[PDB]
């Protein structure tokens, strides 16, 4: 245990440079540079940082310390939209003795990521730390994978409609986006077991979606009978109860049995050797996951993920991994005049916001409440209030009044909207498809 303190004492004595030790856990094996501060990072802590760099509590505040991704007793930043966390040990060892007491005393406290000053004892912040953090998620385990195929564009005359297959459909965001872009659709087969979502889709899309129920019953004969497909897309919100519990997973369980069915059905639906017709696919999962699961998924699909965050073209914090082979999905994410990048443009008439981006939401309305004191995120007549459903719909990019059907209680709408994908992100990925399939 004394190793870390000894190393800190030695550096303060000017015997070693701070770029040659692993500040997080205090080991002399340095292999990487810390993406935020100035120092070294060891192999063991790289995996833990990848895992825990994007995990947040039910209250919206961070779960694990920033430096060591661990912690036992913690402080917390005060500035809203900067809900990061620091633990006692790091503050005392690195910044200086007793600084934690002063940080606790001051009200409101600004952590070291807000302050205009860039140095605090040994803790020194970098200049391009946002870009550094973004690039840090490009350290995949294997790289031998070759570039994907590039099917030559088909001339406009020979183009023909698209046939789709969706797994764990949700409320049919894919069909909505495909209609928005202007691409003809010939089939759209969906699997789903949620009654509210089924009703919403049935009412909204004029019975164009064919439902086939549970996914654990689809056979290869069904796949061969339902005709050739040209796009297979799957992923969350995993409506079918294939993963047992939202919380009992921990960090490891559920992903395997979610990915098994997608791999099986994709294997069944893929063109056989000798056929050169275009074929595309897509798979999605959260950032907070084990390293072994990510390695295995990348091995079996033979590709590496591309992390996309929705806060660049919307007003929410939502980060995910996207496996696929769509044309040129690695290009930079850019906004358009049609987006609403602030929470002040999503509220109704006569209401005032308190943040810039909505932090987090869960199944229960208590999630929308903010702070350990449970204060609400909106101001109205100098009295705090929670977001309405018509405001969440704008936040997520859906058309307004999209989910008003079938006399659902106003609590189920919140879940339906929270579990769904983000429209502006999916449009980004689907945009290139116009070069291969006809248009209205």
């Amino acid at each position: 245990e004394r190793t870390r303190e000894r190393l800190v004492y030695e550096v303060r004595q000017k015997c070693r440079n701070i770029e040659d030790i692993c500040i997080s856990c205090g080991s002399l094996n340095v292999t990487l540079e810390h993406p935020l501060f100035v120092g070294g990072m060891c192999q063991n802590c790289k995996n833990c940082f990848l895992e825990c760099a994007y995990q947040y509590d039910d209250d919206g505040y961070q779960s694990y310390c920033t430096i060591c991704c661990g912690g036992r007793e913690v402080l917390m930043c005060g500035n809203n939209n900067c809900c990061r966390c620091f633990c006692v040990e790091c503050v005392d060892l690195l910044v200086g003795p007793g600084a934690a007491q002063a940080a606790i005393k001051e009200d409101p406290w600004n952590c070291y990521m807000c302050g205009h000053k860039g140095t605090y004892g040994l803790l020194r912040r970098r200049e391009d730390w946002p870009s550094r953090l973004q690039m840090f998620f490009a350290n995949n385990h294997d790289q031998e994978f070759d570039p994907p195929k590039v099917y030559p564009p088909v001339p406009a005359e020979k183009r023909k409609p698209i046939r789709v297959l969706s797994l764990f459909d949700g409320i049919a965001t894919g069909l909505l986006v495909l209609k928005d872009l202007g691409i003809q659709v010939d089939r759209y087969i969906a699997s789903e077991v949620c009654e509210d979502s089924i009703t919403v889709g049935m009412v909204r899309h004029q019975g164009k979606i064919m439902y086939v129920g549970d996914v654990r019953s689809v056979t290869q004969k069904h796949i061969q009978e339902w005709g050739p497909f040209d796009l297979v897309i799957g992923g969350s919100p995993c409506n079918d109860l294939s993963i047992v519990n939202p919380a009992r997973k921990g960090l490891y369980e559920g992903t395997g049995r979610l990915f098994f069915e997608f791999y099986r059905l994709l294997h069944d639906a893929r063109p056989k050797e000798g056929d050169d017709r275009p074929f595309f696919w897509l798979f999605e999962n959260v950032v907070a996951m084990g390293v072994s699961d990510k390695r295995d998924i990348s091995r079996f699909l033979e590709s590496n993920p591309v992390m996309i965050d929705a806060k660049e073209v919307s007003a929410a914090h939502r980060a995910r991994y996207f496996w696929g082979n769509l044309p040129g999905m690695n290009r930079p994410l850019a906004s358009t005049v049609n987006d609403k990048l602030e929470l002040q443009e999503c509220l109704e008439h006569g209401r005032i916001a308190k943040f810039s981006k909505v932090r987090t939401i869960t199944t229960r309305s208590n999630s929308i409440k903010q702070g350990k004191d449970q204060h609400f995120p909106v101001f109205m007549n100098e009295k705090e209030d929670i977001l309405w459903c018509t405001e969440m719909e704008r936040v997520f990019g859906f058309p307004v009044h999209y989910t008003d059907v079938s006399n659902m209680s106003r609590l189920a709408r919140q879940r339906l909207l929270g579990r769904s994908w983000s429209v502006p992100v999916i449009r980004h990925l689907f945009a290139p498809l116009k070069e291969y399939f006809a248009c209205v």
Binding site: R216, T219, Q220, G256, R257, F260, Y263, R264, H267, D268, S292, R295, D296, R299, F300, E302
Partner: protein
């Protein structure tokens, strides 16, 4: 003779050719395969703690009779990645070595 085993594995993902890792990253190996008839096939799995090598992609494992990914479906049956079904015959522990047997099922 052998002591019955009750804690069944949940997965068997192909690590190398002829090595399979369950949900706890323990290595099982197929030691023998029995061929009764054209539609009846049996595989014997045994657990050995060995030093593992670099992992292989499915395109490098190559064609093989065995599947690439088993999984424990409810009610105690194992489905494979080819949509077939397999049945657990016995699961026993002898003198510290644990053995598993899987039997294919006809097509209906």
């Amino acid at each position: 003779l052998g002591e019955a085993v009750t804690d069944h594995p949940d997965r068997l993902w192909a690590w190398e050719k002829f090595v399979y890792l369950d949900e706890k990253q323990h290595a099982w190996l197929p030691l023998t395969i029995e061929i009764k008839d054209r539609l009846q096939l049996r595989v014997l799995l045994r657990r050995e703690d060995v030093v593992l090598g670099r992992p292989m992609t499915p395109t490098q494992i190559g064609p093989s009779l065995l599947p690439i990914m088993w999984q424990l479906y409810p009610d105690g049956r194992y489905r494979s990645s080819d949509s077939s079904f397999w049945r657990l015959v016995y699961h026993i522990k002898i003198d510290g070595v644990e053995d598993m047997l899987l039997e294919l099922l006809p097509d209906d």
